[PDB]
Amino acid sequence: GSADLKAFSKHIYNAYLKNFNMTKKKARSILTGAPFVIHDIETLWQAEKGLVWGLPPYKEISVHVFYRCQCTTVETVRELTEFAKSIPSFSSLFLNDQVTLLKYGVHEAIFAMLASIVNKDGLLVANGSGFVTREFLRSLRKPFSDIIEPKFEFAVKFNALELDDSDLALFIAAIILCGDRPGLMNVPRVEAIQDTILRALEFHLQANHPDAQYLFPKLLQKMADLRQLVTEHAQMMQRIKKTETETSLHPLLQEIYKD
Amino acid sequence: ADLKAFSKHIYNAYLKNFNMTKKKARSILTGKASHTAPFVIHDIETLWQAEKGLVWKLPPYKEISVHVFYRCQCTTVETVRELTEFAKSIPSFSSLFLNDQVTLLKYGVHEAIFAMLASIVNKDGLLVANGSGFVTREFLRSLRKPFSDIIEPKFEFAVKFNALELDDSDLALFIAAIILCGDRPGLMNVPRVEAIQDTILRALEFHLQANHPDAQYLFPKLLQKMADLRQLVTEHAQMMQRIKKTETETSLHPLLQEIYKD
Ligand SMILES: Cc1cc(CN2C(=O)CN(c3ccc(C(F)(F)F)cc3)C2=O)cc(C)c1OC(C)(C)C(=O)O
Ligand SMILES: Cc1cc(CN2C(=O)CN(c3ccc(C(F)(F)F)cc3)C2=O)cc(C)c1OC(C)(C)C(=O)O
Numbered sequence: 001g002s003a004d005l006k007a008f009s010k011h012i013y014n015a016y017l018k019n020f021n022m023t024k025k026k027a028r029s030i031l032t033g034a035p036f037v038i039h040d041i042e043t044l045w046q047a048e049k050g051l052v053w054g055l056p057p058y059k060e061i062s063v064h065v066f067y068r069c070q071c072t073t074v075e076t077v078r079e080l081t082e083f084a085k086s087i088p089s090f091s092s093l094f095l096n097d098q099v100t101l102l103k104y105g106v107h108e109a110i111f112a113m114l115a116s117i118v119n120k121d122g123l124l125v126a127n128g129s130g131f132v133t134r135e136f137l138r139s140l141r142k143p144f145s146d147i148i149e150p151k152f153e154f155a156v157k158f159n160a161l162e163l164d165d166s167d168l169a170l171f172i173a174a175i176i177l178c179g180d181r182p183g184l185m186n187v188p189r190v191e192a193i194q195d196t197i198l199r200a201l202e203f204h205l206q207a208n209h210p211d212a213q214y215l216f217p218k219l220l221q222k223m224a225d226l227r228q229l230v231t232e233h234a235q236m237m238q239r240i241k242k243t244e245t246e247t248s249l250h251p252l253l254q255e256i257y258k259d
Numbered sequence: 260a261d262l263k264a265f266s267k268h269i270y271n272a273y274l275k276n277f278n279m280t281k282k283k284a285r286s287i288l289t290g291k292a293s294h295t296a297p298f299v300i301h302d303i304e305t306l307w308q309a310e311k312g313l314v315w316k317l318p319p320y321k322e323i324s325v326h327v328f329y330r331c332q333c334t335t336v337e338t339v340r341e342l343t344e345f346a347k348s349i350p351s352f353s354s355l356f357l358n359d360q361v362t363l364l365k366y367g368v369h370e371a372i373f374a375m376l377a378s379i380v381n382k383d384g385l386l387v388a389n390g391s392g393f394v395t396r397e398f399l400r401s402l403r404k405p406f407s408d409i410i411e412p413k414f415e416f417a418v419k420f421n422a423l424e425l426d427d428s429d430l431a432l433f434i435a436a437i438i439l440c441g442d443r444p445g446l447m448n449v450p451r452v453e454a455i456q457d458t459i460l461r462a463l464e465f466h467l468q469a470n471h472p473d474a475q476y477l478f479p480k481l482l483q484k485m486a487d488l489r490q491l492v493t494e495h496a497q498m499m500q501r502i503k504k505t506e507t508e509t510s511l512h513p514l515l516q517e518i519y520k521d
């Protein structure tokens with residue numbers, strides 16, 4: 001019961017703090033209370049020329065930005081994999097089930113954690129060293145600016161819920177341990193693990209937020225929302241694959257977007 | 260000179276992760292570890308005795324052949340777990356993305372299994388249940404087709420492989436080289452896996468020079484054995500496809516389903 005759920009929430013939070021360089025706490029402190037502002041080609045060039053900062057050969061500004069996004073995503077996938085391994089029953093699954101869960105869960109988790117570094121106006125990059133304006137990303141030629149804006153739209157609404165890192169750790173864990181993923185082998189184990197994570201989250205939310213009896217179902221709804229946000233992203237990704245043939249696709253992201 | 264240390268790492272991972280070594284298997288198979296011997300399984304009655312606590316402590320089945328096939332599946336799942344831990348105790352394997360790790364295990368475990376099987380096989384049968392039992396080759400031949408057809412080529416491979424006289428320290432490197440194969444379909448970082456495999460093969464060549472000084476060619480014979488194992492597994496998978504097609508009452512463990520997919 002309780003105190004089992006308290007200890008579980010604490011363990012999950014500790015692994016989250018162990019594995020994610022940027023926390024919402026740190027990010028909010030940067031966004032208030034300074035990072036190099038990237039809002040046009042000139043400031044981007046300054047950032048790249050030592051100021052803020054491995055990539056495939058240069059093609060153009062929009063593809064360069066797309067490449068930096070891919071590199072960020074690969075790094076966050078590595079961190080999410082280490083995080084999930086520290087989740088108690090995750091490592092008892094067969095390695096292929098672990099991979100299946102990561103494959104279908106990382107982008108939902110990435111978009112959820114993105115809100116931690118987003119506000120109305122832009123987002124932190126390079127571990128908080130830079131801040132890229134939403135306006136600049138809107139200015140990229142597109143299908144490339146189309147790809148990014150729905151993430152802001154999701155993030156500002158998600159940040160209205162005012163979660164903290166301790167809540168998020170459980171939220172991300174529940175996203176990875178999802179019983180619905182196609183090709184999953186031990187559906188009952190994964191569902192039981194998720195059930196424990198979500199029960200811990202309901203407890204943890206009570207002990208944190210005024211009431212939070214409405215927040216929990218809203219979070220469950222956000223997980224559903226994350227699913228099809230990723231679906232839309234994948235469609236955009238596929239057509240970027242179809243039409244932007246000079247744009248190289250990182251191999252891990254190719255494997256993930258496969259199917 | 261570093262190759263000696265690399266070999267040592269890999270041997271340590273092997274001794275740490277495999278329940279059965281060849282040293283132990285040979286001592287059991289030549290009556291040097293017990294007053295007489297492991298319990299012999301050669302008919303339906305001795306199989307029932309063995310399962311009555313004596314050797315062991317399964318899905319729905321209707322006949323002896325399928326029962327034995329289910330025991331084979333259980334052994335294979337356990338060995339896949341052991342090979343997975345062994346490969347992870349190789350740091351450069353663990354530096355790969357998890358999906359590349361799974362790809363290498365998926366296409367390498369059966370080659371590795373068939374090689375390690377030679378360690379517990381002789382002319383007359385094989386050790387089961389971590390050496391508590393010995394199931395006779397003749398009993399396995401008495402199973403109906405296609406189950407007796409699938410097992411016998413493993414014996415034919417094993418007898419020839421044991422003629423090479425490898426020890427556990429050679430096998431540890433051989434198995435590592437089987438798993439770290441740059442050829443596997445869908446592999447993501449082919450060059451990194453190839454560099455690892457090359458290091459393993461250099462360590463193995465060195466180790467064979469040091470361990471088998473009158474090695475009549477032993478390293479090329481082992482490379483050929485790797486090709487042979489690939490052909491053995493191809494034929495095994497064809498037989499499995501025929502069992503999937505024609506023995507529809509016979510269930511396949513989910514992990515083996517995933518491995519055999521495609
Ligand atoms: C999953 C995903 C997330 C995001 C959100 N995001 C990041 O995380 C990092 N970043 C960003 C933007 C501009 C710069 C600068 F160079 F201008 F400074 C540096 C970093 C950004 O916009 C964007 C895309 C396209 C995604 O899609 C890909 C990656 C293809 C995927 O599917 O993995
Ligand atoms: C990979 C493989 C290896 C082998 C070789 N072998 C074992 O390992 C264990 N054993 C055995 C034989 C008889 C008994 C007893 F019941 F009589 F006690 C107990 C164990 C045996 O004969 C056999 C088959 C069909 C294999 O193929 C499957 C499993 C489908 C696969 O592809 O994984």
Ligand SMILES: CCCCCCCCO[C@@H]1O[C@H](CO)[C@@H](O)[C@H](O)[C@H]1O
Binds near residue numbers: 092
């Ligand atoms: C399709 C690929 C099948 C072979 C992948 C090997 C599966 C073994 O994977 C292992 O299984 C254990 C559960 O028994 C887990 O504890 C381990 O973390 C995992 O590495």
Ligand SMILES: CCCCCCCCO[C@@H]1O[C@H](CO)[C@@H](O)[C@H](O)[C@H]1O
Binds near residue numbers: 082252
């Ligand atoms: C097919 C979908 C792929 C999603 C899972 C990829 C997870 C990355 O995998 C991780 O990457 C590291 C690479 O440095 C290895 O050290 C880690 O052992 C591994 O867990």
